[PDB]
Design a protein around this ligand. Structure first.
Ligand SMILES: *Cc1ccc(C(=O)N(C)CCS*)cc1Br
Ligand SMILES: *Cc1ccc(C(=O)N(C)CCS*)cc1Br
Ligand SMILES: [Cl-]
Ligand SMILES: [Cl-]
Ligand SMILES: [Mg+2]
Ligand SMILES: [Mg+2]
Ligand SMILES: [Mg+2]
Ligand SMILES: [Mg+2]
Ligand SMILES: [Mg+2]
Ligand SMILES: [Mg+2]
Lengths: 234, 8, 234, 8
């Protein structure tokens, strides 16, 4: 694409500069260019890809929620015309485009070349996340299939992570956190969400004794997010 | 209080 | 442009929605479309135009400062290649484009149709601001002319505001605040900056007795910004 | 502490 003429290493360097400057759209464009070079990504590069797109889509999701709230109130109210719906639809279409872009990178060809557990689980978690973001805005006849695509990606990631990673591994923990959120607020399964968060937390607790001080800090940080959700949900 | 997903 | 097919009132409505959603790039595009309808702007519409572009350019300026700092440190240091300069230049060019867009709207044709003091001073202040932002990044042979363009716009705004507005008027106060910053950090005239801030503050203080409670709150808020700068600079 | 200009 527009990054085809830039060296892979320069794209990575510029993605890191864009992160420092809080230019997340640029960051994502640089990392998309890096992925499209066709080589596998290192751990650090996968993290840069994730940070970039999660910030871009996070801004879109927050804006969509503001606009959706205004639209819902308008349908309680004076007729103000089509503008609120039109603008919510504009933001929604942009958000869906970003999700489709990330899913396209995962399908062409990040997932199929990812053989180590850490990379494969990471990419499958990402796939579940971006289908989950599509599900947040889906209202039509494909909503069930979008939800099932998220579930299927998360489930494959969970199966690999349980077999190949320790219960304190940060990717395993972040995956479980996000799949639990999927259950709670996408799949209408709050009991499954709570069970998954509690079991994940307790199994990580029992494995903390094996860790260095730095790994302990990494794992306990995510465990606290699981606890935050359990406190909110119970 | 919004539920947590994996961010930073 | 791309907004030529949307009704003026719908552009204004969507600009307000974009503000609520913190979508300032969309906000600015909507307000540019509204200006290009060719009608004069109301007080509220001028404020929407200002908010939109100040947020867009503010993000660019903050990113430029981060990148410029990194570049300066690199020129103390290992050779890392052209990437830092290239990316700082990319952000700089985008910033200059936004400034040129705003200046173009002011020249075609907001300023020439603005006859009331409140609108004319507001637009001339804006013109000074966007030349000031160009001056922040200027390093070449036009830097002196860019600085003089900012000075000239601010000076015309000051002359009108002194003749036609009370010393507590928020536009007069915000203009003086920004012109004082221009003196301090663009024109290398800290004494002029301090004198302007002090005289503006003291003349506003003396006129507060004429104001309602709500106008008093409006004016004292800006007076505090002048005081903040005086405390920093003295 | 960064100097103030007219913002919000
Ligand atoms: C996929 C993923 C898992 C874990 C992290 C992480 O260590 N965090 C502290 C973020 C909260 S889960 C990041 C990512 Br991306
Ligand atoms: C041009 C301008 C003047 C004054 C205001 C204002 O009342 N503020 C509170 C912002 C700080 S000066 C806004 C604008 Br735009
Ligand atoms: Cl729209
Ligand atoms: Cl670049
Ligand atoms: Mg190469
Ligand atoms: Mg491989
Ligand atoms: Mg293993
Ligand atoms: Mg019309
Ligand atoms: Mg007129
Ligand atoms: Mg008057």
């Amino acid at each position: 694409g527009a990054m085809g003429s830039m060296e892979r290493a320069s794209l990575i360097q510029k993605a890191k500069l864009a992160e420092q400057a809080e230019r997340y759209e640029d960051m994502a464009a640089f990392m998309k260019g890096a992925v499209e070079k066709g080589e596998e990504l290192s751990n650090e590069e996968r993290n840069l890809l994730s940070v970039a797109y999660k910030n871009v889509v996070g801004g879109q999701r927050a804006a969509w929620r503001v606009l959706s709230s205004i639209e819902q109130k308008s349908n309680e109210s004076e007729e103000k015309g089509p503008e609120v719906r039109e603008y919510r639809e504009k933001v929604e279409t942009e958000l869906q485009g970003v999700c489709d872009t990330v899913l396209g990178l995962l399908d062409s060809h990040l997932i199929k070349e990812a053989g180590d557990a850490e990379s494969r689980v990471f990419y499958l978690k990402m796939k579940g996340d971006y289908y989950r973001y599509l599900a947040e805005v889906a209202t039509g006849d494909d909503k069930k299939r979008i939800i099932d695509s998220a579930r299927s990606a998360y489930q494959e990631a969970m199966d690999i992570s349980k077999k190949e990673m320790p219960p304190t591994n940060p990717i395993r923990l972040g995956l479980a956190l996000n799949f639990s959120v999927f259950h709670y607020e996408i799949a209408n399964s709050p009991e499954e969400a709570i069970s998954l968060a509690k079991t994940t937390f307790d199994e990580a607790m029992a494995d903390l004794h094996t860790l260095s001080e730095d790994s302990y800090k990494d794992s306990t940080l995510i465990m606290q997010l699981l606890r935050d959700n359990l406190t909110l949900w119970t | 209080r919004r539920r947590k997903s994996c961010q930073a």
